[PDB]
């Protein structure tokens, strides 16, 4: 997270860490939505251009973490995956359109003060919160600069940007399954997600029912915090039927 601060304990109970068994390295971030399903960005798992294709057996999910590199004995839980599902129309050949993936864990995790899932938005909530100017929050154990890694989970609150402005900031085709967030160069405020944060959540707190909803997923960007650029996120509500399907087709 560039220009973001350390989080608090219990601040993002849904934040997950995807770990690689060998080498033991942080890979991506994710979120817990039920006691058995974790949600991440598909390119964290599959990206042919760079020969990336992980399978159940190559990953570990650490939940309840705060520190990045330490095994927080008695606080975090480590689970194995049972199945990974990628969106059948994930577009890695062009613009990471539909950058969403679901992971089923072996056994259900128990919640605690540090582990709790996040809500998934319904049409009304999406409609009322995905507006330009509304800030949302992103967290992760990613890079602190483009070119410098944090010891604790970082946070940053970013405004959502007007689609046309998102569009005029790049030469990549933005679809309706993506939104962008960040501050205009003119707002003299900074922050962004960066390498290591992909897959994590973008949540908003509902001022109607005091709940946190995950509106997006960290998907891509052109660098980290460049003035003029914005970060793109996957639009969870637009891919929610997908979500439902696999969950009520493969478990809960």
């Amino acid at each position: 997270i560039v220009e973001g601060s350390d989080a608090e304990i219990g601040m993002s109970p849904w934040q997950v860490m995807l770990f690689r068994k060998s080498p033991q390295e942080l890979l991506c971030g994710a979120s817990l939505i039920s006691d058995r399903w974790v949600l991440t960005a598909a390119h964290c798992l599959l990206y042919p251009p760079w020969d990336k294709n992980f399978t159940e057996n190559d990953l570990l999910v650490r939940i309840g973490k705060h520190s990045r590199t330490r095994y927080e004995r008695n606080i975090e839980k480590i689970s194995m995956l049972e199945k990974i599902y990628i969106h059948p129309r994930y577009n890695w050949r062009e613009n990471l359109d539909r950058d969403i993936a679901l992971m089923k864990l072996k056994k259900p995790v128990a919640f605690s003060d540090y582990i709790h899932p996040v809500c998934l938005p319904d049409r009304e909530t999406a409609a009322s919160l995905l507006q330009a100017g509304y800030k949302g929050r992103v967290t992760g154990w990613g890079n602190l600069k483009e070119t410098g890694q944090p010891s604790v989970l970082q946070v940053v609150n970013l405004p959502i940007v007007e689609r046309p402005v998102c569009k005029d900031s790049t030469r990549i085709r933005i679809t309706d399954n993506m939104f962008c967030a960040g501050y205009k160069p003119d707002e003299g405020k900074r922050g962004d997600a960066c390498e290591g944060d992909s897959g994590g959540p973008f949540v908003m707190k509902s001022p109607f029912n005091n709940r946190w909803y995950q509106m997006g997923i960290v998907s891509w960007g052109e660098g980290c915090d460049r003035d003029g650029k914005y970060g793109f996120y996957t639009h969870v509500f637009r891919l929610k039927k997908w979500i439902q399907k696999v969950i009520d087709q493969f478990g809960e």
Binding site: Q24, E25, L60, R68, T69, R70, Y71, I78, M80
Partner: peptide, 11 residues
């Protein structure tokens, strides 16, 4: 950089 995790989680 990371710390060793309880062998049991790799198997």
């Amino acid at each position: 950089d990371f710390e060793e995790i309880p062998e049991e989680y790799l198997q």
